[PDB]
Amino acid sequence: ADYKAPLRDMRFVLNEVFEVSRLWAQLPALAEVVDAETAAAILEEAGKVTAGTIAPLNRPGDEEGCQWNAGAVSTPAGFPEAYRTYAEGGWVGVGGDPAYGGMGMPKVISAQVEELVNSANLSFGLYPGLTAGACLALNAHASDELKDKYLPNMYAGIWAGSMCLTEPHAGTDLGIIRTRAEPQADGSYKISGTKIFITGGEHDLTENIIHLVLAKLPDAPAGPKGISLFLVPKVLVNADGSLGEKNSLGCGSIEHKMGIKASATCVMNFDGATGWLVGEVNKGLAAMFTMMNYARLGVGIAGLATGERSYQSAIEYARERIQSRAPTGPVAKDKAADPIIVHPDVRRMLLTMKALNEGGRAFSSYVAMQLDTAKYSEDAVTRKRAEELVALLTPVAKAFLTDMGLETTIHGQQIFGGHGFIREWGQEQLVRDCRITQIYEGTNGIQALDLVGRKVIGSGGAFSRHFTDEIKAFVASADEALGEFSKPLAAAVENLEELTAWLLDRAKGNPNEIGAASVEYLHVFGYTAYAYMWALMARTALAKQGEDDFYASKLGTARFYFARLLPRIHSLSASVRAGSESLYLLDAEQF
Amino acid sequence: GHMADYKAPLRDMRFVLNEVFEVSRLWAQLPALAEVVDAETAAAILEEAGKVTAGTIAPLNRPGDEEGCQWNAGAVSTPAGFPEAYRTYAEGGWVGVGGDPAYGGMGMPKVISAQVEELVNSANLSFGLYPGLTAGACLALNAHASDELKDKYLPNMYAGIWAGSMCLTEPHAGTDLGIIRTRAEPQADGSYKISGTKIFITGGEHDLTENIIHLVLAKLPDAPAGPKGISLFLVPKVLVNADGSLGEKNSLGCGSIEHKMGIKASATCVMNFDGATGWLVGEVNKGLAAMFTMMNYARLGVGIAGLATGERSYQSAIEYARERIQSRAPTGPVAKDKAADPIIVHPDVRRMLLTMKALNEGGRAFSSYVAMQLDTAKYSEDAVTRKRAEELVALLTPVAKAFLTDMGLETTIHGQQIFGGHGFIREWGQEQLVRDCRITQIYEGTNGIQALDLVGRKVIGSGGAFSRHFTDEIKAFVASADEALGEFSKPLAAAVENLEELTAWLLDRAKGNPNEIGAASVEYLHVFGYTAYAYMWALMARTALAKQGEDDFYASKLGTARFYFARLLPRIHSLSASVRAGSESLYLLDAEQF
Ligand SMILES: Cc1cc2nc3c(=O)[nH]c(=O)nc-3n(C[C@H](O)[C@H](O)[C@H](O)COP(=O)(O)OP(=O)(O)OC[C@H]3O[C@@H](n4cnc5c(N)ncnc54)[C@H](O)[C@@H]3O)c2cc1C
Ligand SMILES: Cc1cc2nc3c(=O)[nH]c(=O)nc-3n(C[C@H](O)[C@H](O)[C@H](O)COP(=O)(O)OP(=O)(O)OC[C@H]3O[C@@H](n4cnc5c(N)ncnc54)[C@H](O)[C@@H]3O)c2cc1C
């Protein structure tokens, strides 16, 4: 199965359900840069480049992997050429600041482009995602000199970015980093230390790589309040903008990984490398606050993108592979067996993927819409509500879309039976690739702890009530037909509210309760949020039913979600309600 | 990084067999076993199996994955060290540990050979599958081959000097063996000539043995259409002289091997038969039925392969979780002299670890319970006892296959996720175990086909009588429980009630509605699985409560039981609700609307 961009579903979500073009027209910051016509032409081109240049390199990229030769890292055959086309097309800076040569597309558009590229070839997609991420942090916190020297080449994709955070002993716990930044009389800093697991730390796609390095000044306090952020170029830039002296840094090695094998994962060594402070001393983590809001959604989209790619392979296979006969009797009388889509269990797996992919795509767009409101709204109370929904929902997007993407890729493989275990079919690679999204931009367990700890307990539940108030107003608006979906949605919202109240009470004076609830609570939240997404899509499909087979497909998928997936909330809620006690009965030596 | 050293779980294996199931009291009143096995005999075999699996097989797992098998002009080579390690294994008697002593097998009951299978499969799944094939092939030949074929082939196969293979699958025929096309031409000398292509043949060709004895499904020229025309043939790689020495190379070969997700050291062969000489096993047109006993044992075996990956993943994860320091316990810093606390202090890490621990220990107990039913079915002098054991084998083997492998996958995912980013790196061995575990969910058939067998044949097919045999035993256990055991027996009874109601719902709903059976199948099998594990956990709890004292093993077991009941058993409700939705939501769309 060739990758085909899901542009019809993407139009349905953005233009028919959320009607985002209505919102742009009101915001003169976006009215200048995008309209329905512009957005449509951007998606058609993105679909063309992703299917035509990027998707064909996915399988051979996994089979070849990256190579390390005396410090130089090479990507698989055709990756540098495909990157050059991508970058020349403007795709690295599509959501970039126009003040420095970016296209200025809102996140609802750049997030769809992200899905297309990551579906086509996740290894390829992560490369420009780094650069776009690094730009967010430099735009928000770097000095005018740094922004003017580095942003234009990064938005053009001529220079790549990297995030150099993780050390051998420090991933989640960045407060204990050892990398040091020594202040120089000339205003610069010399960075010394070792970073690991650095995606795109070194490669052959760009003439330069602009590293954002977490380090501590020698007099820094211990823990996270001692952390600073530095811009450290691979190649120092001469006064006239030409490339100058190679910086005192290098890639010592690349990792042997489960998946995204075409993604160079670098041990980066810094030996008094010259760099410049981004933001303020001791406020390195705050310098990444915006970057990480956008990255949490972007990682969710990466997980979803692998699920979408697996479904495209699985449905084509389920229509072509013949095996056994339908339980109600032979369907394909002209043949020796029936297409496997006739079998109940095959339909169960396919529909689980379809409902999770389409629900995840809707939720990704909803979250992108909150980021765009937070950024672009002229109303301060509107911006602030959007900021609170970003803070609540980005961890959910990160952990839930990646956990559902993994289940989706596993169904996609299992549909093929034994053939799914063979690499030439591509399904096994998507499982391996999808596993990276559950630890990329930190572990999902840390995302779920942020949700329950800071976003739920930390706001007294107020942030959640902003979300569930919007859902309840939706329910109150529902006509009789939409009641099929609004009624179970309301019951799901009540279940989540009671579980929230249980947790606020149980967590008082019992810190272990927070982590104990975290992951399963985040799942209850996720299935509740997808019920809201599915009810919103059911409302539009009910209105347009009979106008196009697309709407009948949407409603059948919705009905599967509510019938077989939404009931997942009950077991998860009961497990959460068991509390932390059974996690702590045993001492570490008793395991 | 490094895959943690494998250590056989002999203490847990003793608790399950000797303490919970009391297997020596059962072997006492079984004359055919009194002769060959007792507690001390069994303990000495387990100690020996633990040494060879940890010492010579486990160290080859990672390098075996990294090298994989090679194909050179039809010769298949296993990774470096596999032939030498196989020679050691075979010379130790491990290939024939469960085989018939009449042809030189050790004759161990399934409760013991199932434990040896767990050890080798945990150490190196690719390795463990090779002797698995031979043992399975022996079961079929012993059950159905003529005296002449048994006498000529079984001794070398039990000794592991000659390997076996199962040559069933064709490009167009996997689940549906009924449409196979491989042809068997009768010869005047009493032999047949086999022509056809088989694919996905594990150990079809390799460098571990001087001969491979293929069990090939094929059809005579005048055979009926469909599965009723299918016969089974013994087709050796190399024809054997009267004196048992190797004669002429048979007219067959390996055209290629597969590129796979996992078990990369397991040669997966396209096998071409070009008028290859072989001999009929059992009866013309009863080739599928000649594998019935072999497939009952293989289904438990594949369950055990999934559990093995999970046990290996836990050994690596618990060592890592005690050594890796990151962040501080929620209730306040624990390692005051260090920069961070061991990650085992974190609620989410404990949840993942305890999920693996409870699924591994529950699964181990369930695998021993099923093995016990296979042994009772084979060895009991009492026809009532034998018949009931056969009925539970029929019911529980599909649950063993699909549940232990599905829970194995979840277990290996947790084991990788515990490491965070480190878990994605091949040197730690956690990502391989996920890839190896995925094979078990499609080995000896897809899990969805096992689930369909359970609900279609074993539940609907028996009007629920097989299930009521199982649940009768559970309720008698519940009725017997004292006050302390009530902690576990009370929620067990509620789980049994839930399962019985779901069974009654399904028997009614399936009437005239064939889609309902497949619609319910996988999730119903999971409800059954968690109910069965609740039974296993209550049995282990009863023994631990009785022995709770100076041996801390019993405290660990009860804490694990308590996690199973608090956090995993509740999974039955959502699965029961999903099943009760029925097939309707699955058939709202036409194929074109997907
Ligand atoms: C392929 C790859 C690409 C990556 N790319 C980059 C990148 O470009 N740049 C970069 O800087 N990083 C990168 N990372 C690092 C990535 O974000 C890691 O997931 C992160 O460092 C955490 O994993 P770790 O192995 O360091 O685990 P640790 O942080 O040591 O975590 C170990 C375990 O402890 C748990 N844990 C730790 N602290 C807590 C706590 N407080 N509460 C609860 N549980 C806790 C974790 O969830 C996990 O289960 C990459 C990782 C990989 C594998
Ligand atoms: C690594 C590996 C090793 C193998 N080794 C051997 C071996 O040594 N010997 C051997 O003989 N075989 C072997 N096989 C083949 C294997 O045992 C099964 O034949 C295979 O797993 C079935 O998958 P398939 O691709 O043939 O799927 P199909 O049978 O084509 O099924 C495709 C899909 O349709 C579903 N389906 C099909 N029929 C039905 C039905 N009636 N009801 C519901 N769902 C249905 C399946 O569950 C699956 O999801 C091996 C396979 C692999 C991957």
Residue numbers in the entry:
A (entry chain A): 2 to 592
B (entry chain B): -1 to 592
Question: How did the manuscript describe this experimental structure?
Answer:
In this work, we identify the dominant fatty acyl-CoA dehydrogenases (designated FadE1 and FadE2, respectively) required for growth of P. aeruginosa on long- and medium-chain fatty acids. The resulting acyl-CoA enters the β-oxidation cycle, being initially converted to enoyl-CoA by an FAD-dependent fatty acyl-CoA dehydrogenase (FadE), followed by sequential hydration, oxidation, and thiolytic cleavage reactions. The FadE1 enzyme has a broad substrate specificity, being able to use both long- and medium-chain acyl-CoA substrates, whereas FadE2 exclusively uses medium-chain fatty acyl-CoAs. FadE1 (601 residues) and FadE2 (592 residues) had the same overall fold (with the backbone RMSD of 1.001 Å) as other acyl-CoA dehydrogenase (ACAD) superfamily members.
